[PDB]
């Protein structure tokens, strides 16, 4: 340090000169959002930019569900349920009340709701069996039977 702080006139090397290490970033004052609403707002930024730049419209379910792959398992399963209840082969009509009143789409909502409730009970029966294997007597045969 003493060899560089004796250096600027005859040793041709590093000065003690102003090093601008700090970049433009979201100011760490109070922004009144919280960690979760800021992660959601960031995923909405990551949604709107793709529409503004003329890209393919992304799935907003996966961009929102990746804010529940974080703190709260009950919000993660709530997003898993919202995903299964939005997995619907909707006719591209100009009218949401016609699609929500369709017989076909109301059958599809119940077909997905039953599939969710059945895989929920399949997860519960799996966890009940794997937690109690000595009672369960599962053996080497994979299948729901």
């Amino acid at each position: 340090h003493t060899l560089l702080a004796s250096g600027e006139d005859a040793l041709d090397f590093t000065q003690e000169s102003e090093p601008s290490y700090i970049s433009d970033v979201g100011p760490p004052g109070r922004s009144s959002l919280d960690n979760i609403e800021m992660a959601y707002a960031r995923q909405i930024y990551i949604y709107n930019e793709k529409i503004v730049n003329g890209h393919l419209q992304p799935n907003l379910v996966d961009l929102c569900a990746s804010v529940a792959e974080l703190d709260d398992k009950s919000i993660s399963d709530m997003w898993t349920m919202v995903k299964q209840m939005t997995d619907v082969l909707l006719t591209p009509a100009t009218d949401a009340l016609k699609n929500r009143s369709s017989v076909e789409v109301r059958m599809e909502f119940v077909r997905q709701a039953l599939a969710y409730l059945e895989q929920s009970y399949k997860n519960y029966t799996l966890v009940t069996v794997f937690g109690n294997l000595h009672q369960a007597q599962l053996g080497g045969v994979p299948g729901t039977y």
Partner: protein, 111 residues
Amino acid sequence: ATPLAVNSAASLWGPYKDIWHKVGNALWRRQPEAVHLLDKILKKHKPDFISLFKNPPKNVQQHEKVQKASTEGVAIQGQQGTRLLPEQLIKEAFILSDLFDIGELAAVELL
């Protein structure tokens, strides 16, 4: 005029007495010069009271820097340039981190 706001969430004592004494001067001493300070401090620290006693969380981007503080050194609010931290203060910061579940930078600001 930027940056530096980066780290004014990590101090687990300095800001909390800064609120408390200025609350006391505004209320129990009834001081007038403290009222346009109180408004600005309450419009600052509304997240803090919305999460009473909630720690700043641990982060790999703090963890790397605290472990590297014996070579690369760490930037501290108020202080010009990066402080080289002793291996003792580094090991003491990870101890406070896993004793309280506070962020690795917040453990260093507390030390």
